[PDB]
Structures are given as structure tokens and as C-alpha cells.
Design a protein around this ligand. Structure first.
Ligand SMILES: Nc1ncnc2c1ncn2[C@@H]1O[C@H](COP(=O)(O)OP(=O)(O)OP(=O)(O)O)[C@@H](O)[C@H]1O
Ligand SMILES: Nc1ncnc2c1ncn2[C@@H]1O[C@H](COP(=O)(O)OP(=O)(O)OP(=O)(O)O)[C@@H](O)[C@H]1O
Ligand SMILES: [Mg+2]
Ligand SMILES: [Mg+2]
Lengths: 405, 51, 70, 108, 395
């Protein structure tokens, strides 16, 4: 006896996912409505007429057993019912594989012709015949609950116009997460790949998460948001596993933007639920090192990190190649503070005795979060007193609440 | 009374018909296919009765 | 179909039944021979069965030819 | 194959004349041999890409017997419109592809 | 616009045609993993469903009376049961050995086909199947390093005849160490692109697992699967995740991970020969590695990826500025002199940022001033976050 030799190269599934399949019609150029586009479209139409006539002729004299509805009706007969869901363990040959049922028992079965052989990889969910356990299909895995959590289904309502004073900060983030997607020609004509990674660092409340919210609002790519504290897991290896799985979902939904908010919280915070101590966090860090810049080729995945403590990060994590741009978010100055106050009071109904200039110097170390909290609390004071107009006394009592006590 | 007697004799044959599994629907699929989880026996892709 | 054209390129209300006549028990009440026929039945034709027909005239008897059994 | 390659796309009548001359002189049985398939190819190469210059040649090919005539005329007609994209010409080829024979008859 | 009306008429007729074509052709749907109907050999599948019977995977345990003509085989059918069966008439007695997986029937459980050993699907995916787009021409300043790496991990497989003749046993392991961005993984990616043997990429964080004995187990199946091939390469990126030195801190500090390193050490150089595997380890913290792992026979070659010199930095600048639309007179030698101790990753960012200053200015060609501003932004302004100062102490 000799071992069977597969004809397919490798044991992984085809990288391409969700294509147009048989409808991959050519990109006829130009899009302008002129003669050669009409001429080009006619050629596509002509061959379809040839294709339509040829296929009809064959099926016309094909046997009654061999028909498009009959063969599909037959396919159900070979599959049978129910269709047991198993797990692919190993691909022994082109038409042979080892599968395991939910009971933990493995069977050496035969892969039928109608199964999509390009979707077969070990660990994938396969559909097996109830009687003979033969592979009769591949179950498209439903979206994991972990996939749904990262993905931001609805873009946040915060836009770049809602950000005040971060003109340079907004500009830098666009060239790494927005400009490469909207205008890739600028990079290609220049011969440089876009800046790989970006990190937003500064004092708390400076607008780091807000700029990512603005980025997520005006992006055509899938946005995945993960807090650094979410990467601390209860069991050994799940920390690295979650980081590995987070960047796998990003690769599936390419192009994608991965926002690792509060990245420093993975190390600056110690929890007893994390079985391994600082050593398990380091292994999680090393896994994140591989994902940002490692052996595996990276698709159109852009990484945004935010932290108010950049001195506590591993310098190897934010090294160039992993995080190219380090955008600083300073505390707002006088011009920015007035802009932030006008931004958060635009929908307000201010009184004639309320001046924003006095509120600018509420505190020397005033941040955007403090300004928004001052306004939000000031409106709450008016809501308590059953009013729609916010007075200076309402703002005065606002400062003593959020800033003090 | 005749219906009660007739239903009683037919019940004995009916009670010998094998019972039905209890499963949990994961998601519905095309061609009236449903992914279920039989309680001890893992997942299945099952048909849907015409009713 | 040819090749595709490319870019360039009154039941009657009655029926006469011969003798013998395969006649339903329901046809009995609705079956009656023509008045002008030379023969007239003794008992009413709606009775059915074998009926002997009276002869009004004395012309040549156009009988029926017996059929040999299979 | 050789004389077709020297005079490819030239419509040289001298090479054309002999290629027909050898073809119909041969007996029907030896036309079953697959080395006779190279004779229409030499004829086809001699008219490679010319297009409308084969009807006179296609006229001579009707005399040749079947199923080689089916093979012969298909080869030269295809070579006549090589690199032309004529959707009308590929209309007839699939018409040949539509009728399936239950080998010897379907060599072309 | 005079053809706008005629475009949509033929576009709609076309779209109707594909919908019509797909009706007869089929291939609609795929959620149940159905291949296109052009590949449906239903005649063979019906015969396959009958002629080829399903086989349960079982492991042979003990062969009873192998010498005699009635050899009985004890098999472990996973979670089902244990059976004492005999071989089928279509399989040689010498083809089934104790401890190997076999295929058995559902009626008499007689062994029908020997099977490959069970290997974790995670370990199987750890082998490289698409080679990276990095060649040795994309690595600058690492000339001497690259020859040492190739002559151990590439030359013996390519031209084995020049080693057997002289009785040479080439080194079977290379450790790449250096500060981050120095090109450790870049050179490994170049190795995988050029190599023709099997390349397996292992990340040290992938060997950290929830349960006790998994990391050692995955290492065992990693080398078990590597040994099923004539020549193999295993790349251990960031070995320091599991390669840390053993210690006793009272409690069980890193005891499980140390066992994973001990198993890896055992496979590299233990009682049994390793095979034809040439391992490749990359780490930015080689000072933390275990002394037994940093020993010849496990890591024979210690290739250091130090910071590039002036000639090396100039070479890296040319590699990354090859496709740039730079000016005619860009002084790359000057640029290399403005970043004395800078990794190759910084030089790439300098090249990328240099084109960014020009793209910002709506200029299609990057001047030398942009590279000068890029060095200030990358080498100088971003020097606060530089990993070089701390990591040269570790290397
Ligand atoms: N420059 C700014 N312009 C406008 N609004 C701002 C600005 N900075 C902060 N804000 C407001 O502050 C709110 C809260 O701050 P935000 O969540 O952006 O903080 P951050 O800078 O990410 O800090 P951290 O996560 O460290 O607390 C935002 O929702 C936004 O409305
Ligand atoms: N010698 C070099 N020549 C050319 N480019 C280089 C060189 N060294 C590094 N680079 C560039 O810098 C990037 C840094 O990634 P690389 O995989 O080389 O880092 P590393 O040495 O493995 O770092 P780490 O220790 O953080 O894993 C590479 O992708 C490559 O583009
Ligand atoms: Mg935040
Ligand atoms: Mg590396």
C-alpha cells in the first residue's frame, strides 16, 4: 500500500472570499457613453447570445436524468436529510478526508464531487451525510459573537467638523486611514506605501477617541474598536488568542481600520482574574507585535492606537513599521477652548448674560472633556429648574460640579 | 362515542410512533433549510415541513 | 429556435341506435323510434328488453346478419 | 507544416496548389491517419489571418471526402480569421460544437 | 450622451442574459458549500456512495501473535469502543504498526487503511503556503548576516552534494537577534520566499495555551509534522515568549511555559535525532533565552542584526527609495549620516514620510528638503519613542 498523494497544493482554502463568481464581468473602459463602449458592450452581449444558444442546445438533447433542475434535485438525494454538521480534521486526498462529528468520533470519509473543494480547510465546519458521513457540503460559519462586538455597525455621528482645534492632528490621521483609501493614486505615483500605523497620545479628554469617532464616521472600511483592557483575559493564551482573532476578522473585512483604544491599559492595570501575571501580558504584547508587523503578510488593515500614557508602552510596540505616526494631542489653548465651547453650545439656547470668554479660564488645565461636561451639566441644571435657556448661574454651578468636588 | 372509541384504538398505534427530537434553531437558511442543535447530538441542517 | 441574431449579422340532441341497441335503463324513458319507420313495437319502447315489432308494410324484410362468436 | 510556416500569412498559391494536390490524391483510408491532419494546417497557415481569402480554397475542399473534409475546412477557416475576433465566425464553430456525435465522426 | 439610451438597452439585455445563463448553467447559492455544477460527477458520486464505504478512524494498540498466520489487532476507536480485529485481505501485515492510526469498518472493524498521524489543525496552519513578497535584495546592510543565514538554512537543501562528499554536517539552527526593526523577520521572510522545502512559521505567543502540557504538545506535533517531509524549515518568531530562562520563584512562576521550552529543546537535540529540520529563531531579547536553548546543536549560529553602518544605511535608503519619485540629486549618503544609530524600519519611515511632505504640498516629486524634514520628524522628533536605546542593552 502507498499513501494517497493530493493533487491540490497546500492544505488551506482559497484566499479569495466573496467574489462575483461566474458574474465577474470585465471592466470595460472607459465608462463614458461612447461608441467603443457600445462596441465593447456589444461584444459582451454577442458572446452571451452564443453562450445562450450553445447551452440551450446541449440541455435540449441531454437525457431527462441529466437536467439542471434534475441534477440539483438529485444532489439533495445524494446529500439526504438531515445534513450532519462536522469538523474537518485533515485532507487526506482530493476526494478523501478525516472528519469528526459533534460526539468526538472521527471518520475517514469520501468528499463528494459537488462539494466546493476550495472551501475545505482543517478546523472548518463541514456538512456530512447522516448515514455515510461523506462530506456533502461546507457550512458557511455564521458571524461569531466576537466578530459582532468589534465591528461598529453604524458610523458614529461625530464628524471632523465637530472637532475643534486639532487641525494638524486631523490632517495627520487622514493620510494614514482616509487618504490612502479615498485617493490611493497619490501614494502610488509617489512610490510609497501609506504610513503603516498611527497612535494618538495626550492628556485625558484631549480628543483621541473623538478623532477615531470622526475617522469611523467618514470611512468606507470596516471599523473594529477594541479597548486595551479587553485584551487581558482570564486564562493563559486567550489574550494572545484574542489579539490573533481580532486581526483575523480585520483581514476578512479588508479594507479595515483597527482602533485599539486605551492600549496602555493592558499593562498599567493589573487584575487577579488574569491568571498569568505580567508574563501573560507580555505574551499578549508579543502577539500584538506579530500582528502589527510580523511574518504574516498584512492586507489593507490600518491600526489606530490611543493612550494617555505612552511612556508605559513597550517601545517595540510603537516602533516604526508597526506605528509610523505618533500624533500628540495637547491640551486645548485659548483659541481651541473657544471653538470647543462653541461646538458643544451650538444646539444650546444660551442666555444674553452667558459669555464663553469667562468660561474659557474656568481652569488652567481645561480639556475638551471638561468643556463638554461643563455644558452637559449646565443643561442638566436648567432641566432641574424646568428651563430651556441656560444662564450664567447654571454654568457657574456647572464648573463647581465637574471640575471640583 | 364512536369517535372516542375510534380515536382510542388509533392512539395505541400512534403512541408507538417514534418521538420527536427537541432542538434549538441557530439560523434559517435558503431552500427551507434550518440549522438546529439537537440537545445531545450537536448540530444538523434539517428540512422544514410543508405546514 | 434558430441561431441568435448577433450585433453584426354542436353536439346533436339525438342519436340513432341500430338493432341491437345498447340502451341504458335511463335511455329507456327517452328512447322512441321514428314515427315514419315501418315497424312499431307492441309494448312501449321505454319498457326495454326484447320487443316484437309490428309490420305496417309487406316489403322485403331487411333483417340483420348474425355475427359469429369469437 | 514547414512550407506552411515559411509562407505563413502570405496566401502563396504555389504552396496552396500542392497542399490541395496532395490532399485529394490520397486515398480515403490513409486520411484516417492523424499525420494527414497537418496538411490542412499547412494550408491554414499559408492563409493565416487573411480572412475572406479562403472561399476559393474552401471551394476546392468540398471535393475531399469526409470526415477529413469536416476536419480540413474547419482548420483552414479558423486559420483564415486568426486574431480577428469575428463573432460571426465563432458563431459557426459552436454550431459545430452543438451537435455531439456518439471520435471518428467528431474529429473536427 | 447620444449612446446613453443604447448603452442601457444592451446593458439590461446583458444583465438579463447572465441571469438567464445562470438559470440553465446553475451555480446559484453556495451557503451549503456547493461547487459549481460544471464539476458535478454525480454518476461517480452515486458509485462512490455505494462502492466506497465509510471508515472509522481508530488507533492500533497491540498486535497479538504477529509471528503466526492469525495476527489479531487491538484498536482504540476514539470515543466509541475498543476492539480486537484482524487485518483486511487488501492490506499487508507489515503496513500496520502498533500506535498508528488506522481506518476500520462499521461492521467487523477490520483495519482497512493506515492513516496519517493526528495533527492539531492549528499546527497544520502554522506552515507557510504562500511565500512572502520579500527577497534578499530587499535587505540592505545585512550582507555578511545574509550569507551566514543562507549557508545554513538555504544552501544545504539546495546543494546537499557539497556537504556529504566532505563528511560535513551543516548547522541545523540559526538565531537572529537584534533591536526591533533591524530586519530579523524581514530576513526570515526572504528565506521563506526563496526556500523550496516546507516552511513553518511559529510565533512564541502561539505556543502559550490555556491547559497544562499543550505548548509542549504543540511542539511535539510541530516536529512530528515537520519530520514527515524530506526537508523542513521551522521559523520561531519571538522565541522569547516561551524561550525564557528557567527559574524558581517559590510559586509556579512560568512553570508551564518552561515545559514548552523544554520540549522544544528536547526535539532540537535530545535522545532521538531531530531529522532534516533546520530551525530559525528570531528575538529582540536574546538575553532572556535559556542557556540550553542558546547552545550549539539547538541554535548553532547566532547571527546578530546590529544597527546598520553608514554603508548599510545608505543601502537601505536606496532599497526603500527605489520606487520613489525623488529628485535627481538626493544625497542618500548625507541622509545615512544624519541617523547614526537608526533601524532599517526608521529608514523606511523616513522614505515614506519624505514622500508625505511632498504629497502634502501637492508635489509629485520629493525633494531633498522633504527627506531632511523626514529625518527630523522620524529620527529626531520620534526619538522619544525609539526602542533602540533600551534594546541594545538586551542584545
Ligand atoms: N478638541 C476637541 N474638539 C471638540 N470636542 C472635543 C475635543 N476634545 C475633546 N472633545 C470632546 O470630549 C469628549 C470626550 O473626550 P474623548 O473621549 O475624545 O477623550 P480622549 O482624548 O480620547 O481621552 P481619554 O480616552 O484618555 O479619556 C468627546 O466626545 C468630544 O465631544
Ligand atoms: N536591513 C533592512 N533592509 C531593508 N529594510 C529593512 C531592514 N531592516 C528592517 N527593514 C524594514 O523595517 C521593517 C521592520 O520589520 P522587521 O520584520 O524587519 O523587524 P524585526 O527586526 O523583526 O523587529 P522586531 O524585533 O520588532 O520583531 C521591515 O518590514 C522592513 O521594511
Ligand atoms: Mg478615550
Ligand atoms: Mg520580527
Amino acid at each position: 500500500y502507498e499513501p494517497p498523494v493530493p493533487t491540490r497544493v497546500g492544505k488551506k482554502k482559497k484566499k479569495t472570499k466573496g467574489p462575483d463568481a461566474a458574474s465577474k464581468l470585465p471592466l470595460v473602459t472607459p465608462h463614458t457613453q461612447c461608441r467603443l463602449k457600445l462596441l465593447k458592450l456589444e461584444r459582451i452581449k454577442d458572446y452571451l447570445l452564443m453562450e445562450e444558444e450553445f447551452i440551450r442546445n446541449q440541455e435540449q438533447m441531454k437525457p431527462l436524468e441529466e437536467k439542471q433542475e434534475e441534477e440539483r434535485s438529485k444532489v439533495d438525494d445524494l446529500r439526504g436529510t438531515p445534513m450532519s454538521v462536522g469538523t474537518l480534521e485533515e485532507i487526506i486526498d482530493d476526494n478523501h478526508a478525516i472528519v469528526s462529528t459533534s460526539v468526538g468520533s472521527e471518520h475517514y470519509v469520501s468528499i463528494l464531487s459537488f462539494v466546493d473543494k476550495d472551501l475545505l480547510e482543517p478546523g472548518c465546519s463541514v456538512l456530512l451525510n447522516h448515514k455515510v458521513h461523506a462530506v456533502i457540503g461546507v457550512l458557511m460559519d455564521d458571524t461569531d459573537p466576537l466578530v459582532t462586538v468589534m465591528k461598529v455597525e453604524k458610523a458614529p455621528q461625530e464628524t471632523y467638523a465637530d472637532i475643534g482645534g486639532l487641525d494638524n492632528q486631523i490632517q495627520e490621521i487622514k493620510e494614514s486611514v482616509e487618504l490612502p483609501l479615498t485617493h490611493p493614486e497619490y501614494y502610488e505615483e509617489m512610490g510609497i506605501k501609506p504610513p503603516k500605523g498611527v497612535i494618538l497620545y495626550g492628556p485625558p479628554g484631549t480628543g483621541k477617541t473623538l478623532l477615531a469617532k470622526a475617522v469611523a464616521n467618514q470611512t468606507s472600511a470596516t471599523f473594529l474598536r477594541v479597548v486595551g483592557s479587553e485584551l487581558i483575559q482570564k486564562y493563559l493564551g486567550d489574550g494572545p488568542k484574542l489579539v490573533r482573532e481580532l486581526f483575523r476578522v480585520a483581514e476578512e473585512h479588508a479594507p479595515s481600520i483597527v482602533f485599539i483604544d486605551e492600549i496602555d491599559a493592558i499593562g498599567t492595570k493589573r487584575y487577579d482574574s488574569n491568571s498569568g501575571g505580567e508574563r501573560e501580558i507580555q505574551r499578549t504584547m508579543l502577539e500584538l507585535l506579530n500582528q502589527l508587523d510580523g511574518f504574516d503578510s498584512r492586507g489593507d488593515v490600518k491600526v489606530i492606537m490611543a493612550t494617555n500614557r505612552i511612556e508605559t508602552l513597550d517601545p517595540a510596540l510603537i516602533r516604526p513599521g508597526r506605528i509610523d505616526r505618533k500624533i500628540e494631542f495637547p491640551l486645548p489653548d485659548e483659541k481651541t477652548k473657544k471653538r470647543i465651547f462653541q461646538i458643544h453650545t451650538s444646539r444650546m439656547t444660551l442666555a444674553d448674560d452667558v459669555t464663553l470668554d469667562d468660561l474659557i479660564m474656568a481652569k488652567d488645565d481645561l480639556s475638551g472633556a471638561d468643556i463638554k461636561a461643563i455644558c452637559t451639566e449646565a443643561g442638566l441644571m436648567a432641566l432641574r429648574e424646568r428651563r430651556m435657556k441656560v444662564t450664567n448661574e447654571d454654568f457657574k454651578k456647572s464648573k463647581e460640579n465637574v471640575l471640583y468636588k | 362515542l364512536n369517535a372516542k372509541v375510534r380515536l382510542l384504538r388509533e392512539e395505541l398505534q400512534l403512541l408507538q410512533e417514534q418521538g420527536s427530537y427537541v432542538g434549538e434553531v441557530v439560523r434559517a437558511m435558503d431552500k427551507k433549510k434550518v440549522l438546529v442543535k439537537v440537545h445531545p447530538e450537536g448540530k444538523f441542517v434539517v428540512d422544514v415541513d410543508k405546514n | 429556435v434558430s441561431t441568435a441574431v448577433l450585433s453584426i449579422t354542436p353536439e346533436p340532441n339525438f342519436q340513432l341506435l341500430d338493432n341491437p341497441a345498447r340502451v341504458m335503463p335511463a335511455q329507456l324513458k327517452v328512447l322512441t323510434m321514428p314515427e315514419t319507420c315501418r315497424y312499431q313495437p307492441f309494448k312501449p319502447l321505454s319498457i326495454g328488453g326484447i320487443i316484437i315489432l309490428k309490420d305496417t308494410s309487406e316489403d322485403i324484410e331487411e333483417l340483420v346478419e348474425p355475427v359469429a362468436a369469437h | 507544416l514547414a512550407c506552411g510556416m515559411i509562407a505563413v500569412g502570405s496566401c502563396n498559391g504555389d504552396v496552396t496548389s500542392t497542399i490541395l494536390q496532395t490532399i485529394m490524391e490520397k486515398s480515403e483510408t490513409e486520411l484516417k491517419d492523424t499525420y494527414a491532419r497537418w496538411l490542412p494546417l499547412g494550408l491554414g497557415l499559408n492563409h493565416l489571418g487573411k480572412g475572406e481569402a479562403i472561399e476559393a480554397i474552401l471551394a476546392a475542399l468540398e471535393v475531399v471526402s469526409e470526415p477529413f473534409r469536416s476536419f480540413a475546412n474547419t482548420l483552414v477557416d479558423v486559420c483564415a480569421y486568426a486574431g480577428s475576433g469575428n463573432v460571426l465566425k465563432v458563431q459557426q464553430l459552436l454550431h459545430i460544437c452543438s451537435e455531439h456525435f456518439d471520435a471518428d465522426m467528431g474529429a473536427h | 450622451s447620444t449612446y446613453s439610451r443604447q448603452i442601457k438597452q444592451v446593458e439590461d439585455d446583458i444583465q438579463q442574459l447572465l441571469k438567464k445563463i445562470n438559470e440553465l448553467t446553475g451555480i446559484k447559492e453556495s451557503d451549503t458549500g456547493l461547487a459549481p455544477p460544471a464539476l458535478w460527477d454525480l454518476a461517480a458520486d452515486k458509485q462512490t456512495l455505494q462502492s466506497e464505504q465509510p471508515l472509522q478512524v481508530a488507533r492500533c494498540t497491540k498486535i497479538i501473535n504477529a509471528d503466526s498466520e492469525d495476527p489479531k489487532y487491538i484498536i482504540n476507536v476514539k470515543q466509541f469502543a475498543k476492539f480486537v480485529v484482524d487485518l483486511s485481505d487488501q492490506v499487508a501485515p507489515t503496513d500496520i504498526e502498533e500506535g498508528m492510526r488506522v481506518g476500520v469498518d462499521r461492521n467487523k472493524y477490520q483495519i482497512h487503511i493506515p492513516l496519517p498521524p493526528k495533527i492539531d489543525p492549528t499546527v497544520t496552519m502554522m506552515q507557510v503556503e504562500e511565500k512572502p513578497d520579500v527577497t534578499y535584495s530587499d535587505v540592505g546592510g545585512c550582507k555578511e548576516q545574509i550569507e551566514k543565514l543562507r549557508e545554513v538554512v538555504e544552501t544545504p537543501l539546495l546543494h546537499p552534494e557539497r556537504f556529504v562528499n566532505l563528511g560535513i554536517e551543516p548547522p541545523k539552527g540559526v538565531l537572529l537577534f537584534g533591536p526591533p526593526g533591524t530586519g530579523k523577520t524581514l530576513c526570515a521572510r526572504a528565506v521563506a520566499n526563496r526556500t523550496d522545502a516546507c516552511f513553518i512559521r511559529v510565533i512564541g505567543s502561539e505556543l502559550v495555551q490555556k491547559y497544562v502540557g499543550e505548548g509542549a504538545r504543540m511542539v511535539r506535533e510541530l516536529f512530528e509534522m515537520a519530520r514527515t517531509k524530506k526537508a523542513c524549515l521551522i521559523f520561531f518568531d519571538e522565541i522569547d515568549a516561551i524561550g525564557g530562562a528557567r527559574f524558581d520563584d517559590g510559586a509556579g512562576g512560568d512553570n508551564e511555559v518552561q515545559r514548552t521550552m523544554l520540549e522544544l529543546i528536547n526535539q532540537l537535540d535530545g535522545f532521538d535525532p531531530r531529522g532534516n529540520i533546520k530551525v530559525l529563531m528570531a528575538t529582540n531579547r536574546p538575553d532572556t533565552l535559556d542557556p540550553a536553548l542558546m547552545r550549539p546543536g539547538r541554535l548553532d549560529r547566532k547571527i546578530e542584526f546590529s544597527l546598520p553602518d553608514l554603508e548599510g544605511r545608505t543601502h537601505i535608503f536606496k532599497i526603500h527609495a527605489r520606487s520613489m519619485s525623488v529628485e535627481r540629486d538626493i544625497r542618500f549618503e548625507l541622509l545615512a549620516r544624519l541617523c547614526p544609530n537608526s533601524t532599517g524600519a526608521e529608514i523606511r519611515s523616513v522614505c515614506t514620510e519624505a514622500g508625505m511632505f511632498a504629497i502634502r504640498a501637492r508635489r509629485k516629486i520629493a525633494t531633498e528638503k522633504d527627506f531632511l524634514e523626514a529625518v527630523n520628524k522620524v529620527i529626531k522628533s520620534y526619538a522619544k519613542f525609539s526602542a533602540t536605546p533600551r534594546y541594545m542593552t538586551y542584545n
